[PDB]
């Protein structure tokens, strides 16, 4: 709990960690995955201006 | 033997003519196929390049 209670809290304050590493893993899978696509896209956006 | 062997390679040699003129006329067809795929966007350079060699 990151919160004191009785206490006035603000929009977006965080309250409680719920122990992700599940969200963790796949969101490490998500990332990998855009690492490669985004370094594939520029090399063909770099390719396609000379039309290779 | 001479005269005959003669007329005999030059009427050959104008069928194979005819059949290389049919052969140019195919590849002219296929290049310009190749020309329209690759200026329409689907075909890179290199297909063209092929067809031309």
Redesign the interface.
């Known amino acids: 709990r990151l919160f004191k209670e009785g206490s006035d809290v603000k929009a977006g304050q965080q309250l409680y960690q719920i122990d992700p590493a599940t969200y963790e893993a796949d969101y490490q899978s998500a990332q990998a995955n855009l690492a490669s696509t985004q370094e594939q896209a520029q090399r063909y956006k770099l390719l396609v201006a000379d039309q290779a | 033997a001479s005269v005959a062997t003669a007329y005999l390679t030059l009427k050959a040699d104008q069928a194979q003519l005819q059949l290389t003129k049919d052969t140019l006329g195919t590849y002219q067809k296929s290049f310009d196929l190749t020309q329209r795929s690759?200026d329409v966007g689907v075909a890179?350079?290199?297909d063209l390049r092929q067809a031309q060699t």
Do not use: D, R
Request: hydrophobic fraction near 50%; proline fraction near 0%; charged fraction near 0%.
């Open positions: 690759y890179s350079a290199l």
